[PDB]
Point group: D3
Chain length 158, copies 6
């Protein structure tokens, strides 16, 4: 059984994140969608809310397990018995910072292989930050989020 | 009559912004210089101050109208009857984020065409953030700002 | 204002990406000249006469587009055509550094010509005539990226 | 899952950077095909037969690697080989824009083939077969970047 | 005597910074390692702590002088009689912002030449921010910092 | 310290961008060798003898510049010249990825040679000898980008 971890802040999980985790499940036997607490980023949704949103958004994917964590990512991956670390790559700006993280994760856990997947063109220009910015100004974001997440974002900003 | 909108935080408006809006007025019949409230950015100048500075800095340009807004940019553009959205492109770092915004604005208002203009080499390495950082340390920024803006920045930091 | 814009390139062959850009340009400016470079440094797959006929047929539905061939420096042609706008398509995979060099050089050559960068649909943001030709030459399906007349001409060209 | 992956390229010659990537791929997937392009647009320094023999010797220690030559479009070969994973090495100096074009085009051609990007060690993150050949041709020491069999073959090739 | 300044926040100084300053001392007669107060960045270590850490980490380098400053960088360089400004370049993301700073410093002091040096591959993917993020999660950062700095970071987070 | 620096390139032809960089290098280092590559992979517009004479005339006012031709690997020449500094000009439009590859490879070849990157004036930050030649060949005005002797030589070269 090959175990992969897909870590991130997921504040909130978007269709771009769903695209990446779906590609991951077609490649690996078990995928852990791992939500980092990320207090330095001052998230809109609590960790508990982010976990609940992601569980509902991924319930159709049989081999996805949603787990929250506050640990060092590499220690959490070792403790999940993961040997693959999934990250999505949209453009050049992502690439540079992704290299730094991956080289640091390799120093902390050499057997954890970072693998980058590319989202559909449909989600190549979106991010959680961009969707929240549009939604704060009452712009329509239904196209970019799972139905349960869209409802939760509308309710959070109401 | 072709109507273009040039939106931004303009905290404060610089010679780089003046260069872009001047190029815009040579191309389109009416240009709306639209100043976003931008509370998430914690601006140095209030919206009212930014509007007053931009009005004075653009008074020599007959077809420029300066307006403040707190709305979703795309809704403000529809409400101004604008069909062109002007953005300045200085370098690669701008380009990536500009694509995300433009693809989102296209999703929100498909008839609003984003057009990117390139500033003079003279202003290709400056930004409102950089000018404020130099000015906070009492460095000379007279070369980068309209006279009224330079006075206001000196007075604000005095 | 009665603006004249130029949209230059090799168009070897014209793709759906080029059609997207020129369509956007026609919604913005009164007259758009789709200008096809006669003698590119790299021998084109299609001759200048073939490239012009394909672009004409593919843009026939756009009333304010004029397809013309040119052999001089793009700024010299723009000046002679009384164009004040230079259309550049900016894909998600474009060499932005080259675009900056080109635009500053074009501004030195003709200051009255303003470079305007337009963004294609996400659908065409990751293609190029170069990539399309390479794939088609290597027996790959490129129908999705081309106007029907171009697809027919490319199959005929690759059959010989 | 019994995954089959393809790792395509010119491998002219195979470097320690390529060995690093293919080694990482073998730790992730059940079967890895190191696929060597037969007729690249630019005449290779080593013939296809030389490139295959060097890659075979350099990967002989990896039990789940199969070295094979191919002459079709990389997606057409992947489809015929029943591969569902496409390995791409991402160096700190790679043309990420080109990688995005390639991956979106490969997804159009074969949607069931997933592009996976692997990162080489920092040690090989700033090299390429191109840079290595250019240095070696100009009398520079490249021993550090190549498997021993490749170093011996390159010295013999440059001596003639 | 050629005098160079190597300015930065150095919060804290890393092996990457040591690599750059060592290369600088092999090229120029006297190198001033200049630590900016940087209040806008909300540093982990006080200026006094950053100066003490850098002094101890560079004591083996005979021609390095460690000095703290709150002034405009260019005025501090003029006041140190420096004619060279050293900056490290790791990747593309650094390059763009470095150009803006260097063109501004050239406007403020034309005789101060900005020179960029490239660190070893070993330190090409690290930063003070990344090392602090790993250390906040109790990850091992001994490989990336001088011994005195590692101790101080462990003690600060204890 | 009595530092010797090398500033290598094709200089085909030397531009105001190159003059800006070498001038900055002379204000920093005791001796600057402007090193002209003899046999570039792409046949140069000007011969090595023409490139040397033009660079000599254009730098005659700088007392600590020595113009010399070289045909070996740039690190092999730097070593033989006892240079410890390698000058690289970094334009706003330079391939930074290539510069990183080059500098890490040069450090592997000669660890005692330190690569130093200098920034040209904003005025020359968007040009290249390549762009200048292409424009001049296509009947464009490039006088602003070149020393007067180079402008005269380029007009004579293009007239034939
Ligand atoms: C500032 C420049 N102006 C230029 N005009 C032309 N004309 C010939 C041409 C060839 C291929 C495509 C196109 Br479109 C135009 N080339 N050229 C340059 O390379 C730089
Ligand atoms: C989407 C594409 N698929 C492609 N398959 C091939 N096969 C020939 C080939 C030549 C050199 C290296 C490699 Br690896 C493969 N080329 N090619 C493209 O250029 C774009
Ligand atoms: C690490 C490298 N060192 C290299 N030295 C030379 N010498 C020949 C040369 C040709 C054109 C311009 C220049 Br400048 C030097 N080439 N070369 C490389 O391509 C990579």
């Amino acid at each position: 059984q090959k175990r992969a971890i897909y870590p991130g802040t997921f504040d909130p999980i978007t269709n771009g994140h769903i695209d990446i985790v779906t590609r991951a499940t077609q490649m690996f036997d078990h995928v852990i969608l791992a939500i980092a607490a990320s207090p330095s980023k001052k998230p809109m949704f609590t960790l508990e809310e982010r976990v609940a949103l992601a569980q509902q958004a991924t319930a159709h994917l049989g081999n996805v397990e949603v787990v929250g964590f506050s640990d060092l990512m590499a220690n959490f991956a070792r403790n999940q018995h993961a040997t693959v670390l999934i990250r999505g790559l949209r453009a050049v700006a992502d690439f540079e910072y992704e290299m730094q993280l991956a080289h640091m994760n390799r120093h902390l856990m050499p057997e954890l292989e970072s693998v980058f997947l590319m989202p559909s063109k449909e989600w190549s220009f979106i991010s959680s930050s961009l969707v929240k910015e549009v939604a704060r100004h009452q712009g329509d974001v239904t196209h970019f989020l799972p139905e349960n997440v869209h409802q939760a974002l509308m309710a959070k900003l109401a």
